[PDB]
Amino acid sequence: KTHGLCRRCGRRSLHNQKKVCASCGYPAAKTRKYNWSEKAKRRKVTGTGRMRYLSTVPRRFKNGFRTGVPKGAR
Amino acid sequence: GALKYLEELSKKKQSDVVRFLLRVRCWEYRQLNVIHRASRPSRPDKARRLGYKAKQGYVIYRVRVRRGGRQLKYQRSLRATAEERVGRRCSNLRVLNSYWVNQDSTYKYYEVILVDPNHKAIRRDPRINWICNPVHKHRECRGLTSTGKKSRGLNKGHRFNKTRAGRRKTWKRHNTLSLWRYR
Amino acid sequence: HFRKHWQRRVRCHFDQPGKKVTRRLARRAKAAALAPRPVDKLRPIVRCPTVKYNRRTRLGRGFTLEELKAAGIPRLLAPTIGIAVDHRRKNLSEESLAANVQRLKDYKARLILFPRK
Amino acid sequence: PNIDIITAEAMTLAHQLATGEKTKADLIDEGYNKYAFKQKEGLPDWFLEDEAKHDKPIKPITKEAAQAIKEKLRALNARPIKKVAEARARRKLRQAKKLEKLK
Amino acid sequence: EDPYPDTVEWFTSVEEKMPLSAAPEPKRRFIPSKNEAKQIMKLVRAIREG
Amino acid sequence: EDGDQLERELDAMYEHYKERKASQDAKYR
Amino acid sequence: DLASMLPHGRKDAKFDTKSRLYELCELAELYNCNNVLFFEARKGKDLYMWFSKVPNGPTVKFYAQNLHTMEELHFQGNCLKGSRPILSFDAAFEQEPYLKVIKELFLHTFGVPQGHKKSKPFIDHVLSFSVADGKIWVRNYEIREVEKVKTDINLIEIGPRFVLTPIIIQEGSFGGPILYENKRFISP
Amino acid sequence: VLEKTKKRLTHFPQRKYAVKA
Amino acid sequence: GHKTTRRVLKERPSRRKGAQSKRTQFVRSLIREVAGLAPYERRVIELLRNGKDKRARKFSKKKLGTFGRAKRKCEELQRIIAESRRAH
Amino acid sequence: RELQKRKRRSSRPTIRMPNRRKKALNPAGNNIIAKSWNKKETLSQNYTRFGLVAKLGK
Amino acid sequence: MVKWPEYIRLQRQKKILRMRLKVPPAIAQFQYTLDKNLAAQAFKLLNKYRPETKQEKKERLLREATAIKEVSKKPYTVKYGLNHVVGLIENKKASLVLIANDVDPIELVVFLPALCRKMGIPYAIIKGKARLGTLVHKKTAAVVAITEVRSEDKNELAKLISAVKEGYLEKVEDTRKRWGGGIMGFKAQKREEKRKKSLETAIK
RNA sequence: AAGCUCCUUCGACGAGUCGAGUAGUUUGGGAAUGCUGCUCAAAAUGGGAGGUAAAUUUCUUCUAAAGCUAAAUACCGGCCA
RNA sequence: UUGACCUCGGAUCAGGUAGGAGGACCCGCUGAACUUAAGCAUAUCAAUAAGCGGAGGAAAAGAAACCAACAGGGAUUGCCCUAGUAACGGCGAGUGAAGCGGCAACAGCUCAAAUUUGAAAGCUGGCUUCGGCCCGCGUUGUAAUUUGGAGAGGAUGCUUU
Ligand SMILES: [Zn+2]
Numbered sequence A: 001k002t003h004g005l006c007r008r009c010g011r012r013s014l015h016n017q018k019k020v021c022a023s024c025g026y027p028a029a030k031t032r033k034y035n036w037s038e039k040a041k042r043r044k045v046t047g048t049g050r051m052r053y054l055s056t057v058p059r060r061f062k063n064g065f066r067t068g069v070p071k072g073a074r
Numbered sequence B: 001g002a003l004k005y006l007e008e009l010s011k012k013k014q015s016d017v018v019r020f021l022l023r024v025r026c027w028e029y030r031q032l033n034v035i036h037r038a039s040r041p042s043r044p045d046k047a048r049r050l051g052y053k054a055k056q057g058y059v060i061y062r063v064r065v066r067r068g069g070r071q072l073k074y075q076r077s078l079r080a081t082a083e084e085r086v087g088r089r090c091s092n093l094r095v096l097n098s099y100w101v102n103q104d105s106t107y108k109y110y111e112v113i114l115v116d117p118n119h120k121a122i123r124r125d126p127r128i129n130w131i132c133n134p135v136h137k138h139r140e141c142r143g144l145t146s147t148g149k150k151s152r153g154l155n156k157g158h159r160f161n162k163t164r165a166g167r168r169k170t171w172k173r174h175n176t177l178s179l180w181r182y183r
Numbered sequence C: 001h002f003r004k005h006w007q008r009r010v011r012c013h014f015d016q017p018g019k020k021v022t023r024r025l026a027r028r029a030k031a032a033a034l035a036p037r038p039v040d041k042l043r044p045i046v047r048c049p050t051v052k053y054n055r056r057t058r059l060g061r062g063f064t065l066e067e068l069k070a071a072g073i074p075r076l077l078a079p080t081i082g083i084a085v086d087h088r089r090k091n092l093s094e095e096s097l098a099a100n101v102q103r104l105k106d107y108k109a110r111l112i113l114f115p116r117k
Numbered sequence D: 001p002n003i004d005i006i007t008a009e010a011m012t013l014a015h016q017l018a019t020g021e022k023t024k025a026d027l028i029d030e031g032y033n034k035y036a037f038k039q040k041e042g043l044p045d046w047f048l049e050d051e052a053k054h055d056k057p058i059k060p061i062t063k064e065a066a067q068a069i070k071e072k073l074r075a076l077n078a079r080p081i082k083k084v085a086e087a088r089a090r091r092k093l094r095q096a097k098k099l100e101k102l103k
Numbered sequence E: 001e002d003p004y005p006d007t008v009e010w011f012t013s014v015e016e017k018m019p020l021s022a023a024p025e026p027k028r029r030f031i032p033s034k035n036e037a038k039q040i041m042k043l044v045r046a047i048r049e050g
Numbered sequence F: 001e002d003g004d005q006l007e008r009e010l011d012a013m014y015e016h017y018k019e020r021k022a023s024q025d026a027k028y029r
Numbered sequence G: 001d002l003a004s005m006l007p008h009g010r011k012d013a014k015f016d017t018k019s020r021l022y023e024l025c026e027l028a029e030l031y032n033c034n035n036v037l038f039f040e041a042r043k044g045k046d047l048y049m050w051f052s053k054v055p056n057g058p059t060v061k062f063y064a065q066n067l068h069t070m071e072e073l074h075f076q077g078n079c080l081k082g083s084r085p086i087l088s089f090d091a092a093f094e095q096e097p098y099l100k101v102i103k104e105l106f107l108h109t110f111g112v113p114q115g116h117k118k119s120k121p122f123i124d125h126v127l128s129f130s131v132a133d134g135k136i137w138v139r140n141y142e143i144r145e146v147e148k149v150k151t152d153i154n155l156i157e158i159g160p161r162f163v164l165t166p167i168i169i170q171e172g173s174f175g176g177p178i179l180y181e182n183k184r185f186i187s188p
Numbered sequence H: 001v002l003e004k005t006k007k008r009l010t011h012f013p014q015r016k017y018a019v020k021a
Numbered sequence I: 001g002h003k004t005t006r007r008v009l010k011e012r013p014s015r016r017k018g019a020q021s022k023r024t025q026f027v028r029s030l031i032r033e034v035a036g037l038a039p040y041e042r043r044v045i046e047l048l049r050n051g052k053d054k055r056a057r058k059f060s061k062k063k064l065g066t067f068g069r070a071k072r073k074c075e076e077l078q079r080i081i082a083e084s085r086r087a088h
Numbered sequence J: 001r002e003l004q005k006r007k008r009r010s011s012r013p014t015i016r017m018p019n020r021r022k023k024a025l026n027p028a029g030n031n032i033i034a035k036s037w038n039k040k041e042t043l044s045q046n047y048t049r050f051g052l053v054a055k056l057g058k
Numbered sequence K: 001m002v003k004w005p006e007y008i009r010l011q012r013q014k015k016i017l018r019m020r021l022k023v024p025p026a027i028a029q030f031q032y033t034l035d036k037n038l039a040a041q042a043f044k045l046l047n048k049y050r051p052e053t054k055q056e057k058k059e060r061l062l063r064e065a066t067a068i069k070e071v072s073k074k075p076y077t078v079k080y081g082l083n084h085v086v087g088l089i090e091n092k093k094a095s096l097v098l099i100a101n102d103v104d105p106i107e108l109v110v111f112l113p114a115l116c117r118k119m120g121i122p123y124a125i126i127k128g129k130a131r132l133g134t135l136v137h138k139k140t141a142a143v144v145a146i147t148e149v150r151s152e153d154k155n156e157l158a159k160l161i162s163a164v165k166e167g168y169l170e171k172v173e174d175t176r177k178r179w180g181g182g183i184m185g186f187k188a189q190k191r192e193e194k195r196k197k198s199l200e201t202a203i204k
Numbered sequence L: 001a002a003g004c005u006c007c008u009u010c011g012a013c014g015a016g017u018c019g020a021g022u023a024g025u026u027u028g029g030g031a032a033u034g035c036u037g038c039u040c041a042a043a044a045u046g047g048g049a050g051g052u053a054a055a056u057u058u059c060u061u062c063u064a065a066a067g068c069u070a071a072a073u074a075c076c077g078g079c080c081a
Numbered sequence M: 001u002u003g004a005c006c007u008c009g010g011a012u013c014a015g016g017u018a019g020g021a022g023g024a025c026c027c028g029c030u031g032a033a034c035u036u037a038a039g040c041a042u043a044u045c046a047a048u049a050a051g052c053g054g055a056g057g058a059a060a061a062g063a064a065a066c067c068a069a070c071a072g073g074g075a076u077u078g079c080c081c082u083a084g085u086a087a088c089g090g091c092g093a094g095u096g097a098a099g100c101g102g103c104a105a106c107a108g109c110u111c112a113a114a115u116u117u118g119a120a121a122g123c124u125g126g127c128u129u130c131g132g133c134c135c136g137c138g139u140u141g142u143a144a145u146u147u148g149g150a151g152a153g154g155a156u157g158c159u160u161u
Helices: A038-042 A057-062 B002-011 B016-031 B044-049 B078-089 B120-124 B146-151 B167-173 C016-033 C065-070 C094-109 D008-018 D024-029 D045-054 D063-072 D081-102 E034-049 F004-022 G023-030 G097-109 H003-011 I022-035 I039-049 I053-064 I067-087 J002-009 J032-036 J043-050 K006-020 K036-046 K054-069 K082-090 K112-119 K129-135 K151-167 K169-174 K186-198
Strands: B035-038 B058-066 B094-103 B107-115 B177-179 C010-012 C045-047 C057-059 C111-113 G035-042 G046-053 G059-068 G086-088 G125-131 G136-146 G152-157 G161-170 G178-181 H017-019 K096-099 K123-125 K143-146
Touching: B002 B016, B002 B044, B002 I022, B002 K082, B016 B058, B016 B094, B016 B107, B016 D045, B016 I022, B016 K006, B035 B078, B058 B078, B078 B094, B078 B107, B078 B146, B094 B146, C016 J043, C045 C094, C065 C094, C094 C111, D008 D024, D008 D063, D024 I053, D045 F004, D045 K006, E034 K054, F004 K006, F004 K186, G023 G035, G023 I053, G035 G097, G046 G097, G046 G161, G059 G097, G097 G125, G097 G161, G097 G178, I022 K112, I039 I053, I039 I067, I053 I067, J032 J043, K036 K129, K036 K143, K036 K151, K082 K112, K082 K143, K096 K112, K096 K151, K112 K123, K129 K143, K151 K169
Parallel strands: B177 C010, G086 G125, K096 K123
Antiparallel strands: B035 B058, B058 B107, B094 B107, C045 C057, C111 H017, G035 G046, G046 G059, G059 G161, G125 G136, G136 G152, G136 G161, G161 G178, K096 K143
16 A cells, blocks of 8 residues: 555555655645645635634633732632 | 944955955855854944944854856845845844855855844844834845845836835736726 | 736725725824814925916925924924924925915914923 | 967957957956956965865857867767767667667 | 065155044043943932932 | 974875865776 | 948947036047047937037037938848948038038048048948938938949948938037027927 | 933923814 | 026035045045055056056946046046155 | 634634724813713814814815 | 864964965054064053953942042043044044054954054054953953053153154064065975976966 | 024045946836846945936936834734624 | 963753744745637736745835926825826737826834043843842943934023923
């Protein structure tokens, strides 16, 4: 078989000779994307995943990125 | 007033004193790396008029660029390629300006002024802390240095109609169809 | 004249009443910060350059240094009391000097200046 | 002393001077350039060889100057009847194998 | 030719008898230092405040 | 004093550098 | 085109319009020339031609219009480069005194002296000057020889067409007293 | 701010004024 | 055109950009002694000393590119010869 | 677009932005203009009542 | 054979190149330097007028502050600073000027001997920017000047001026207009002879 | 510390950069419209761009080769309405 | 012998910063062909698409080496007309601005070139009992003053914190 499991995108698209992923280009620091495919861009853009940290930023903007603890709290 | 004497000396680059010094320094720079750090500017009059100060946060870097051509002609100067390679080498610094120092038949030599935006001396001092702002990240990449402004044709007059306020911006404004509500 | 891709560069101004409201609220905002002051600076009266428009007159950028001095307004005080100053323009005739001196005098007569702190 | 024109660039200056294109006055006057009045006498070999690799002046050559140099520097047994014959025979055979492969 | 000719001093052989600058001298070159008195009064405030 | 002895060795390493670099090709050997 | 006509002519580069007009005389002394043909241009559209003897002689300023150069493919004529031309003048050139001054300056500029080593040994073209309106019309023609029917000359146009409008004639080299003024010149 | 800027704002600040109609 | 009474304006300090500074002319003359002469300036110096003044101006145009630049360059180099024979 | 769909499926609250403006629309404080300003009126209408001018231009 | 480091080889090559290259006379004059005695006699006067250190300046500010909480002459001091000394030379205030001989961009001081000569100020090229740098309380100092001294040693300053301008300036009057360098040794002379031997049959 | 005033005192302004030649590209724009490479390489009552047949380059208007700066302008993305 | 300075190194040294994502809009670099000219090669498509680098809530541009020829205008940006005009193209297919004018919005400034020289007056650290202690950077120049429709320095008398 000419492709194995990539470790960055999880697809079975890592070449066993070139050792380069055909979907993301794993040894490269940048993730592979091109503008001639809008379908490929929307398959891996923000929002396709879980959003551990980026979903918590807008609530902290609303209150002004404040620190501390409300007065009188136990 | 030693710097006015230095300014007139750099006007006479073909004279005996300057051509001797530029010969022995061209050999010295070729013995060193393509990009390396200079402790002090080799042309202190030129660096000071371009905005260099002997403060903690200002550094000087020397760079060679291979001269010639690609018959295709590159639209940016060799000074621009010199600035981008130094900025890639020193990613934490900001490129302020650069100047010519030496010239060979194979290489052009430049010295780049860099400013540290996280040094406290730079940040507390006005008239330099504009470079600490995030709008000035990689000015040499976007053509905001002195050689960049010349290449983009950003000069006043009837001789720069297509290039003032951006060439692609002026082209786009001239090629949109504007339709109002009451036509 | 549609040899290019005009379909990807076409601007429709459906925000014409929306931007009018935005501009009027921006004018209201600077009237709230500068409450008794006008929202505009006083501007000189100049003559249009070309021979097509010699007979007509319009508002210029700022008052000259010489016409500011003849009216009794100091240089460093004029921007603080709402007067635009143009260091590039020149008088070049007594007619342009006299009209702007009279305009600055009429502004002085109608001015209420508050005593600092 | 014998002056032998080996480089194609010296041939280019020779073609210019021998034709009525550059005079004796123009050659002397244009020899006062930035590569002039540079000493090479007592200088070390490591200093001078670094310069000669990196200070060749960039002035163009002509194709007739380059043609004169190769025909001057051609050897006497470079193109004999025997070697030209086998070279033509080798090229004819190479086309025959291509026709065999296309067969 | 002489490839390394000696320098003929055509300009420096005539000695200039006056300074280049005809600008006046300030009072500060003739009087005690104003900066010195300011640093002293800054120190006086610190000793007075302890 | 005139750097003769220092110049002797500096040319010796330069010749040694030239022969070492040029001998990396089998044709020159 | 005109420099190719003149074997005794030396071409000269851009002259500073911010200089003085008598610096042309210092310029022509340097190149050892006793005639100056000055092409002066205004506004990037107009042409003015000056003819002058260099130290002391007269100087005439023309306005050149209706230019048609050799590269235009409708002429069908060609001649030797550097050959001695036959100068065709008009009868008006010998009647008016100001046209007599212009004729001598035309004979000096387009003369091609007799034994010049850069010239050509045969005659195949004629340079013509004609006063039709209050202007001078300049034409070149090729002397083409045709065998006579039981030889004759036919003229085929070769080169530059340009109309010269005489503006002024000076007594000095590029400045001095005014001997003739047009007083009918309508400038562009 | 620079102390040349601070001196200009100290002695010539933006004033409060009105214009009669 | 229209009859408007003219007034005279103050001399513009930007119009004084034409340099008359005695200190800068001092520095330029002192640096010229220190720095020396370019290779092409030596050719002009030799041609002016030999009396070939016409050849000097032709050569200096071909090196500089303008009659105005060729005229000035031969004039500064002429005064160097004048002041050198005065010192010698 | 895909991020906007991700919010609709998720049980995370929609963070509603209050309508805050960079610049205020009415004068404030204890001075003569702020006590005599009418919020429902316009800039020219308030300056008419005050007796002042608003635009010095044409 | 053993290999030197790059930076050791580079600075040793520069030492050879200073000797072999024929330097222009503005550079060449910095080779000639005053002897051990005149250097030591000049520093006998300059050490008397040393600028005060940061510690004893703070003590003097504190002493005058304490007296105020509970009449001085003009300070006389060795003048330093390149833009400061050049202004003093041009204004004809410096009585004696001492220039370092190892300024790394040499252009900074290449005009100073010509400027001192035109202005008429006695000058001397010292050996060491570090020794001048320790006379003032710094690391390096390119130039050092004396404007005025106290009344006790006006005679010794005038003797030092007569010492420098006669015991240093008269020897360099002979050799400051001519080019330096050309200190070719035995190996360089054999290598030049081998070069000219090769260009005797057929210059290629 | 600062603003103005007066004057028998001074008044420093950016070079491998302008410019010339050439090649390529670009523009409505060979006074090359701009840009880049190579060769040569400046000035100080200077330099740049214009006006002008008007009699000689007269006149007009600006100071390049260092730098910062909100608003009116754009917006298929971001937080919302 | 010892000690300075210069250049160049080491450390998991003390404290920092860069990379990736996003890329609708923005600043650059690189750069086609289909099409049209009923074919096609200059031209047009198009200084576009694709490719590469770099930011922000805007970016960029920006306070004249400008426009103009006037009775003058006066940093930049955008809208309306200017105008399918000038100008350039076998003076084909065609390509194609700008000044003035009417509005929206307007805001001006910082250096280098001058010696504080009767006093490096400037600043990074890191030890603190938080007030001030040292280590250094720096005179090959850090503060103050000045930035050419200006300015300095003296004198002079009012006016401002
Ligand atoms: Zn992958």
